Every structure is written in structure tokens, then in C-alpha cells.
């Protein structure tokens, strides 16, 4: 009866509080999605337990074993009742799980270290001196892998063949790579995360150019779950009340460092 929430450690959506070893249950975490989960639970009238996804993945269907991993897999195989995280709504996932209307809009974007002579995806695709990649798993990588758009196909061809690998395991690694590469590495990630990092010291990164696409994050539930309807209505209510905007401002700008 206690709703099991699967989420993922991804600043500023879900983070461990300072000296968390001394805290219990949900009180161990904080962030945009922690606040969102509380608001949704409050609106839908249920108790919940926040759990961090085991493999630390968002969700992808293995070609080899066909087994969904990450938060999507947790829902598909009945391990969790709802996923509250920066989980991108995609066609492939929509076929196996349900998504509420978007609680946040974003698009793939380019992160560069300030000073890098790049302002668009076309620019990256037309040169080789500045390397570029994405999270080694996730919707961003999948977008490039499945895209037939000329520029993105060219970018994907390069990325999947680049050696050393241009892919990273976490956002933190992607950021560190941009920073330590002296402008020789550009990172492709979702816009709202790009905007978040822009506000983190040493304030040496920036989002450049427009977004490569447009999509959103949604609250996910198992396909056909009765919880889906109510959660979707809560997201809409929260959006209309301005709560969603308040949360972004709180975690992105109020706590900004630049």
C-alpha cells in the first residue's frame, strides 16, 4: 500500500543531503524530484518510499537480452509503482510504460567550456578538433543513434567510431571532461541540465545555440496502472498552480553560484 518510488541520483533532481549517513528513509534525499514527489503524494493522498534505481540507469531495452534496465525496467517488471525523475518521454518507452503529461520541457543541447568556437550542431559536425559525446546510455544517445537528420547522422557516425570513447557514464563525468579538456570537448545533454551546470562554480561552462529537439520529462507508471491517471492530474494541477516553476527556480537559480 506504500507507493514504491524509483528515482535516480542526479543533481539537482535527487541528491544525498549533507552527512546523510545519519538520516533515515526519504529524509536522506533532497532536490527537485524529492520536492515534486512530496507534492504529488500530497495531492494524490498516498504514502511513499523513495528508492534509488539499482543500476543507476534511466532505462534502455538491451538488444542482447531484451531486458529493460534502469527505472523503466523497474516499472516494466513490477519492482516499483512510479518513477519520479528526469525521465524523458520517448516513443519507445511510451510503448512499455505510461507517462504523465510533461512536468518539464527541454531539448538536447550543446555544453561547451567558455571560449570554445562552437555555436551549433552543424559546427561540431563540420570539424574534428573538438571532440563531442553524450551519456553512454539514455535518450540523448538514442536520439543520435536513431536519427535520420543529415547533421545528426553525421554526428552519430563520428561518435560511435571515436576512439578514445566520447561517451561518459554520468553527467558529472561529462562536465568534468568539458572542463578538463580546455575547450577540446563539447558535451551533448538535455537543456535544463546544461542550464543547471551553468550555475555551478567555477562558472566556466555554458549552453550554446538553440536546442536540437523538443521534448519533456514525465512521471512514469507501469502500463495500465490505476495510479497513472491521478498522477497526471496532479502534474497538471501543480503546473497550473506555478509549483513546477517554483521548484525549478529554487533548485536552479535560488541556489545558483554564478
Which residues line the annotated binding site for L-glutamate? 86, 88, 93, 139-140, 190
Cα separation, 76 vs 69, in Å, equals: 9
Among 115-123, 158-166, 187-195, 205-213, which window interacts with ligand U1K (CB under 6 A)?
A: 187-195
CB of 54 to ligand U1K, least distance (A): 16
Are the CB atoms for 82 and 227 separated by under 8 Å? yes
58 touches ligand U1K (CB under 6 A): yes
Name the residue nearer to ligand U1K (CB basis): 43 or 51: 51
The single residue among 14, 50, 76, 189 that binds ligand U1K, judged by CB under 6 A, is 189
Are the CB atoms for 151 and 142 separated by under 8 Å? no
* Backbone φ and ψ of 194, nearest 5°: -60, -45
Name the residue nearer to a second copy (CB basis): 44 or 176: 176
- Give Cβ neighbours of residue 60 (< 8 Å, ≥ 6 apart): 68, 69, 70, 72, 137, 138, 142
**Total residues at interface with ligand U1K (CB under 6 A):** 13
Nine cell digits for residue 231: 498522477
Return the ∠ at Cα 71 (arms to 175 and 156), rounded to 5°: 50
Cα separation, 108 vs 23, in Å, equals: 36
CB of 2 to ligand U1K, least distance (A): 25
138 touches ligand U1K (CB under 6 A): yes
171 touches ligand U1K (CB under 6 A): yes
Q: Which residue ranges make up the site for ligand U1K (CB under 6 A)? A: 10, 58, 86-88, 135, 138-140, 171, 189-190, 193
Amino acid at each position: 500500500k506504500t507507493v514504491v518510488v524509483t528515482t535516480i541520483l542526479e543533481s539537482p533532481y535527487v541528491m544525498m543531503k549533507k552527512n546523510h549517513e545519519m538520516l533515515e528513509g526519504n529524509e536522506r534525499y533532497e532536490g527537485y524530484c524529492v520536492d515534486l514527489a512530496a507534492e504529488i503524494a500530497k495531492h494524490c493522498g498516498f504514502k511513499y518510499k523513495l528508492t534509488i534505481v539499482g543500476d543507476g540507469k534511466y532505462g534502455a531495452r538491451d538488444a542482447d537480452t531484451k531486458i529493460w534496465n534502469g527505472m523503466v525496467g523497474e516499472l516494466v517488471y513490477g519492482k516499483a509503482d512510479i518513477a519520479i525523475a528526469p525521465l524523458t518521454i520517448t516513443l519507445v518507452r511510451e510503448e512499455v510504460i505510461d507517462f504523465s503529461k510533461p512536468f518539464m520541457s527541454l531539448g538536447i543541447s550543446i555544453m561547451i567550456k567558455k571560449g570554445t568556437p562552437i555555436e551549433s550542431a552543424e559546427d561540431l559536425s563540420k570539424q574534428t578538433e573538438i571532440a563531442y559525446g553524450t551519456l553512454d546510455s539514455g535518450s540523448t544517445k538514442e536520439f543520435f543513434r536513431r536519427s535520420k537528420i543529415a547533421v545528426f547522422d553525421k554526428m552519430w557516425t563520428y561518435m560511435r567510431s571515436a576512439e578514445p570513447s566520447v561517451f561518459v557514464r554520468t553527467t558529472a563525468e561529462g562536465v568534468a571532461r568539458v572542463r578538463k579538456s580546455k575547450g577540446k570537448y563539447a558535451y551533448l545533454l538535455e537543456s535544463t541540465m546544461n542550464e543547471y551546470i551553468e550555475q555551478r562554480k567555477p562558472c566556466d561552462t555554458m549552453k550554446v545555440g538553440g536546442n536540437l529537439d523538443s521534448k519533456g520529462y514525465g512521471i512514469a507508471t507501469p502500463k495500465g496502472s490505476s495510479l497513472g491517471n491521478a498522477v497526471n492530474l496532479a502534474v497538471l494541477k501543480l503546473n497550473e498552480q506555478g509549483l513546477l516553476d517554483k521548484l525549478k527556480n529554487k533548485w536552479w537559480y535560488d541556489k545558483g553560484e554564478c
